[PDB]
Design a protein that fits this description.
- 2 copies of one chain form a homodimer.
- Chain A is of the alpha+beta class.
- The first copy, chain A, has 2 domains: 1-150 and 318-452 and 591-684, FAD/NAD(P)-binding domain (3-Layer(bba) Sandwich), CATH 3.50.50; 151-317 and 453-590, Polyamine Oxidase, Chain A, domain 2 (Alpha-Beta Complex).
- Chain A contains 19 helices and 30 strands.
- An 8-stranded mixed beta sheet of chain A has the order 9-8-22-23-24-19-28-25, with helices on both faces. In chain A, strands 11-2-1-15-30 form a 5-stranded parallel beta sheet, with helices on one face. In chain A, strands 3, 4, 5 and 6 form a 4-stranded antiparallel beta sheet that branches.
- In chain A, a hairpin with an 8-residue loop joins β26 and β27.
- In chain A, α15 runs antiparallel to α16.
- The longest helix of chain A has 19 residues, at 227-245.
- The two termini of chain A are 45 Å apart.
- Chains A and B meet through α8, α9, α12, β16 and α13 of A and α8, α9, α12, β16 and α13 of B.
- The structure holds flavin-adenine dinucleotide (2 copies) and phenylalanine (2 copies).
- The site of one phenylalanine has 5 residues of chain B, from loops.
- One phenylalanine binds at residues 124, 294, 594, 636-637 of chain B.
């Protein structure tokens, strides 16, 4: 059944537990305030006003409301992005960003009467993203309507790889133009081999607990599993999967699966003519371009099988939209709701400042220091009781890695190489303080953060009349125009998304949404970085013409006598001249789009995911928590940012209670105690 | 033992055979002209004037000299780069490029009296790069002097990873500041595990033919290996290594090796605080930052083990300089020698034009078509007998991939999406024509090329007085200043290279040479793309200050209780203000620096490497060959470009002789017959 409201989606994934946190359903943990704080007047900083920082603010507001008369929380939120919604009370971006939730409003002079929205970052939300939908309910209510995201396969789709063309909806051969397609056949082989069957015989190549992944997904998503089953997944079976397969790439796993299927005769020689290795390779690459429901994962073939398996267990591709004009509205509404729930006990101030350094210093009550620069490069220093560092890993690195790894009598911190003013701190310890006695422990967390993999990504947009889809040369599936195109043209994945400002006259032509090497191949043509146009009134016309030129390819369709230039070239050219656009996340200060783990990376990302458990070590007294999708096992999803925020606040509560986990609610306790601790000594 | 001349290097590597072409020493094959051509007047195009194209030209000259009176070869060389040396017959680059062999001349107004050279691309040449040194002899003579390239470890070096600092020269612990260093221990573990022993017991973890790679390297390099050894490596043992390990990344292999050593007790818990998996991870990441002799291979951890193994067998890190002021002189000299060796039978014309399309068309004997655009964007169409496509894979894609995969009655080819004029070709076949009957076969080569991995890379340079190294603040080790710095600061690898224009007053401060994610992390700070400054008179001061600022880190050393800002900060800041520079290969039209194969990519790269064997099918009228390091098993080396050129010309000979391999010399025949063919034709 298709979910139709926020509440329907919310309930669908409410119990789902991810395999690295299999003892807890984050939505259940988040149902009530996470815990209790001692009486006091707290001074907290949140660095970053994206999904992570704003979810953390919301949870702090819920905590604040439980404080007794005379107590409260003050939060300073640092947000360097001048386009953040936090600083706002033709293509417009000002006020339309919340980090990587980022809209561009296409208008003709009056932004209150726009044509369309480009969703530059986050855009499609898994049904089983339970924490995402929990917060969407807080922001919009359960009754608010949602739509199926128009992914390849969800709407009529054209797929092109090499000489192969397909036109399809879903996976039922009755809905494919060629029901005998090799593409659909290889999908079945690769899906059988990776996911397997929820009932009956185990057919998957890479079992978890000796069974198909499908069977484990059903346990992870149960209300009342075995408890014993979740513990065994958490402590035994998922760790054993990691031990076996964290060194195996997705691309290698696809090839293994295809090889066995080819040997068995489930897949035929390609064309009847290619030799064994050529046939296997063709199928591997065909599947690579086709994907799992959101376009080709070829560019993602270097991720570990472990990372892919997380997405498989989550049924990640089954996605919806939010009940918004622009996705940034979600984060803005959560910010406003934070302030409302705090019931007067939370006070929030926004600083348009870039944090340059964090440390612990001095001997005062508040020892968590932040050094920042304002928009005219003036320096500021402030000390806090606790700090949540809600920025992704490459943005976190300069803040946490330049103070060394142990006690220092004095340091002059700041951006001295930029010629900016430094600040002297005394009796200095690193911010990410895992040990009082081991510089290597402090170095492990810093070095791990700095070597996480930020996947590269870019989006090319234009504005097109929706009626362009009705041109005679746009193909149809049962009378509905093709609205998604997945191709090896260099464009990778393309979408003709109806404007949300409304049938709408205009659509957002997401001409190219690329990852990893697909993005690298395009980057030389972008012209201006990270955004072309850099101005509200420019147009990235030259850039966009290079994308139309990539689509200028002769494509042969079955039964046709000759190839003609691809119809998609014609569609791209139908976009208006004004408002052509590219955003390159790679050349944004994030240094890419979102974390995806390579082989071996589990050790690094999982350390970050578990970092908040430092709060168990009472005498350590570390005041810094981290909150981003970079510090999760769902990089590239709001779910990851939100999970990491929940971890950070849970840890903060434990720390504020000097290591006492009974200060967490019963439901929230496993956020801390269901993970391996990052401090072995001291115990707690 | 250290080679001191071109000739000594040339003779050292003359016999070396790479494992994917184990039957043949390319230098031995290149000792005489590669074969014979029928009498005639050939019209050949070479697309690209880099190492691949120019070596191909040289080999065509050698062939041309053998043709009878009235015969000859006319070559049109297409070169789109306005800075190519081919079009030239403060920071100056004009005339100082040969593709990715690329110099920047720093001068103060008179380019004939410069200060230093930045080697922006190629810079360090393995001793056993036999074909490289063969051509270097052609260009410079055997007597010309060479120097050891000042790699980390070849000169006094500082290494920084997390809390770990090492100062060292070589691999003898006597010359490490800390002979008990964990870095030295992990290096020894990873060498034992990957390379093993040339004599006695086999200790490596990934054997070839059941023995350590060191033993296979000695066979591959032998003047006269045992009977059948090379054939068994080529057909059995190297294919078996690929089948086992091409799905294993380098990073995964390092972790496997470290894990076993940790379990055995060879590597201890890092300190008393880190758990087992944290210690293992620390060692894997420590080794990752240290490397194999040319700086950390952490950014290269996603390469297949097979790709690393190629470099191990080749002793890749043992490298030298060329006998030049600028490396481009090598390619320029080879171009001039090509014309000389042609003995008036080779005529060469240079076209300052960008090729947009290749195809076969029409009914004339010259059926190989190239469509190009000149500097006024005017279209040109020219037909040839044969074409050598000497450009790397992302530059080749638009040329070969937009004509479909079978016959077409007509096509209007060119850059129509750019608004440029097209040309109508009739009776069209794709250029990379593997089959007259299988679109999938034709698709395999195209799709393979387009999905090869171009490693990302960037270089940040500045000019510093060499005497800066003599300041008390620059550490000395074993009698000389530190001149190589390998670090996790974001800079990755840094070198203070004496100017070749001369002890020289100035040095090229290669402040940062990055690969892969290390480059991605920096890219947002480059300011202008692909080069800052974009003009001869500017300086990339703002960009460079962001690099200096990455060096502004408190570094604890054993020799002082109070950590100070890293000395390297001071050194970077000692560079002069003028002539600060970055070049980003990623945003160059190459879409990166050079091919490195991911897991699974052997299937694609090896297809490209073997492509020239199409010439064996006489009934197939394919006139196009490919010549670049992208189509080799040595992406990122001149050796790969040169091997691919040799393949291309060998294939061209066989095609010009209508499939007759006896037209190759005895020693060159294996360039074609020693590989698995890409077409199936009768034995013998
Ligand atoms: C191309 C792309 C596609 C995506 N698609 C989806 C999708 O379809 N579905 C989905 O669920 N998610 C998607 N995501 C992921 C989603 O956008 C992220 O998971 C989430 O927005 C990240 O939130 P965060 O708080 O971790 O970090 P960010 O969003 O990066 O926010 C960090 C904030 O900190 C600020 N900041 C950084 N450094 C400093 C500093 N030094 N001082 C002060 N302020 C600072 C930034 O300006 C920013 O506002 C996508 C993202 C991208 C880029
Ligand atoms: C950062 C870096 C570091 C390196 N380090 C080393 C090293 O230390 N040692 C080593 O041996 N090698 C090194 N290399 C590798 C070496 O530079 C390459 O292997 C070699 O130069 C590649 O030659 P090529 O002919 O394959 O391609 P290229 O050098 O890319 O030459 C292709 C030529 O074709 C032209 N061209 C492209 N497209 C078109 C078109 N459509 N029409 C017309 N002209 C066109 C280009 O302008 C260019 O001149 C390095 C390279 C880089 C970038
Ligand atoms: N959620 C994003 C980013 C992402 C891509 C692939 C894997 C994981 C995350 C998308 O669906 O495009
Ligand atoms: N030859 C180049 C590029 C390269 C790097 C790493 C591996 C292979 C090639 C260098 O030594 O920097």
């Amino acid at each position: 059944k298709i979910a139709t409201t926020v509440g329907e989606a919310r309930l669908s994934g409410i119990n789902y537990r991810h395999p690295d946190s299999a003892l807890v359903s984050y939505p259940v943990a988040a149902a009530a305030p996470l815990g209790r704080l001692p009486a006091g007047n707290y001074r907290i900083a949140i660095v970053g006003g994206g999904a992570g920082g704003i979810a953390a603010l919301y949870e702090l507001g819920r905590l604040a409301a439980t404080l007794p008369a005379g107590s409260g929380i003050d939060v300073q939120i640092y947000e360097a992005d001048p386009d953040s919604f936090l600083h706002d009370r033709a293509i417009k971006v000002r006020g339309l960003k919340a980090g990587r939730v980022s809209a561009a409003l296409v208008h003709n002079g009056d932004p209150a009467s726009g044509d369309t929205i480009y969703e530059v970052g986050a855009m499609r939300f898994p049904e089983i993203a339970g924490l995402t939908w929990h917060y969407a309910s807080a922001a919009f209510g359960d009754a608010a309507p949602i739509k199926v995201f128009p992914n390849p396969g969800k709407v009529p789709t054209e797929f092109v790889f090499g000489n192969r063309v397909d036109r399809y909806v879903g996976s039922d051969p009755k809905d494919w133009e060629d029901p005998d397609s090799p593409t659909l056949k290889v999908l079945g082989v690769v899906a059988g081999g990776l996911v397997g069957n929820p009932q009956g015989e185990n057919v998957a190549m890479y079992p978890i607990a000796n069974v198909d992944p499908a069977k484990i997904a059903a346990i992870l998503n149960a209300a009342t599993p075995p408890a014993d089953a979740l513990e065994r997944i958490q402590t035994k079976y998922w760790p054993e999967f990691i031990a076996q397969y964290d060194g195996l790439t997705l691309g290698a796993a696809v090839r293994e699966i295809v090889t066995v299927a080819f040997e068995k005769g489930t897949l035929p020689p390609v064309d009847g003519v290619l030799d064994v290795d050529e046939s296997i390779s063709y199928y591997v690459e065909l599947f690579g371009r086709f994907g799992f429901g959101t376009g080709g994962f070829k560019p993602l073939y270097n991720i570990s099988l472990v990372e892919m398996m997380r997405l498989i267990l989550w049924d990640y591709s089954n996605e919806y939209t939010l009940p918004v004009t622009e996705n940034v509205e979600f984060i803005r509404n959560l910010f406003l709701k934070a302030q409302n729930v705090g019931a007067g006990k939370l006070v929030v101030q926004v600083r348009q400042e870039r944090v340059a350094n964090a440390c612990h210093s001095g001997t005062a009550s508040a020892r968590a220091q932040l050094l920042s620069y304002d928009s005219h490069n003036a320096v500021h220093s402030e000390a806090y009781d606790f700090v949540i560092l809600a920025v992704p890993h490459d943005q976190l690195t300069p803040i946490v890695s330049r103070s060394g790894f142990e006690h220092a009598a004095s340091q002059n911190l700041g951006d001295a190489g930029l010629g900016l003013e430094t600040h002297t701190y005394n009796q200095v310890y690193p911010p990410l303080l895992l040990s009082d006695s081991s510089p290597a422990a402090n170095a492990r967390i810093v070095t791990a953060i700095g070597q996480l993999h930020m996947a590269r990504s870019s989006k090319v947009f234009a504005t097109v009349k929706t009626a362009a889809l009705d041109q005679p040369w746009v193909p149809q599936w049962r009378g509905e125009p093709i609205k998604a195109v997945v191709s090896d043209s260099g464009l990778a994945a393309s979408y003709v998304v109806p404007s949300p400002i409304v049938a709408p006259e205009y659509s957002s032509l997401l001409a190219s949404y690329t990852w990893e090497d697909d993005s690298t191949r395009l980057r030389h043509d972008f012209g201006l970085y990270p955004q072309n146009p850099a101005t509200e009134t420019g147009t990235a016309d030259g850039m966009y013409r290079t994308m139309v030129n990539r689509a200028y390819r002769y494509v042969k369709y079955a039964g046709a006598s000759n190839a003609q230039p691809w119809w998609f070239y014609q569609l791209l050219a139908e976009a208006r001249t004004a408002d052509r656009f590219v955003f390159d996340w790679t050349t944004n200060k994030t240094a890419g789009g979102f974390k995806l783990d390579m082989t071996g990376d589990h050790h690094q990302s999982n350390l970050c995911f578990r970092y908040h458990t430092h709060a168990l070590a009472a005498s350590l007294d570390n005041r810094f928590f981290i909150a981003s999708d970079s510090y999760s096992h769902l990089g590239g999803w709001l779910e990851g940012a939100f999970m990491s925020a929940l971890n950070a606040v849970a840890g903060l509560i434990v720390r504020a209670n000097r290591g006492d986990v009974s200060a967490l609610s019963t439901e929230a306790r496993p956020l801390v105690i269901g993970l391996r601790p990052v401090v072995k000594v001291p115990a707690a």
